[PDB]
Ligand binder design. Sequence first.
Ligand SMILES: Nc1ncnc2c1ncn2[C@@H]1O[C@H](CSCC[C@H](N)C(=O)O)[C@@H](O)[C@H]1O
Length: 252
Amino acid sequence: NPIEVRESDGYTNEYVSGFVDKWDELIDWESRAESEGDTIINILKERGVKKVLDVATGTGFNSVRLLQAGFDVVSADGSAEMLVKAFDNARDHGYLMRTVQADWRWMNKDIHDKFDAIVCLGNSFTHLFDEGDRRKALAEFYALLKHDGVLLLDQRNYDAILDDGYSSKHAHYYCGDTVSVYPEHVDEGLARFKYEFSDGSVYNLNMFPLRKDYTRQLLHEVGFQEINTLGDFKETYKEDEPDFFLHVAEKN
Ligand SMILES: Nc1ncnc2c1ncn2[C@@H]1O[C@H](CSCC[C@H](N)C(=O)O)[C@@H](O)[C@H]1O
């Protein structure tokens, strides 16, 4: 059956769509690419990666960055509305995106290749609140990797927030002062972040506060052999603790 673009289906809603639109309206990709550096691209190049699957395309930032770097990218997302934005953003940068609508829990339904690398970036994995769904998603990613493939999966540093550290009592800024991100409510099973933009817009979003070692455990448990977790400093006013972690999980 064909996929229809809807502002409200099972994979996105108008609120989250408004949030990503607001981020993209105020934060240009050039600035974001400079602030994030070439860590992702360099990891892939040092591994000889050619074919990449983006499982969390969103409005397309990671996919377009990888296309610009010369990778063969397939751009998947659960949301058809997101994929339309991502395709047109790629078009605006002079690239033809290969979009596929797919749910992490059945990734090979319409994707039949295997990939040198998968990227699941922008703190996307934390959207899953059910442990069974987490294992299912990581198992689906594992199965889509070639024998010597690698999964790049990032997350916010929830350990520092759950342990009542400095980062739990303070907002974190991105793209200068364009947006602040504040952990309004934190418990073992839920973090609600307040995102306040420079134009006065406020969005409140829920995430599952994955501890760094719990994510590593899940990756090991679905079959990944070696995992290296890197501190990833993205925020404007850097602290002793990174605001993100990047897991580099090798299939074999
Ligand atoms: N279960 C699921 N299956 C497929 N896609 C999912 C999903 N849960 C969340 N997503 C997607 O994950 C994306 C997170 S947004 C992050 C987008 C991009 N990596 C960036 O950093 O800008 C959303 O577009 C959302 O639709």
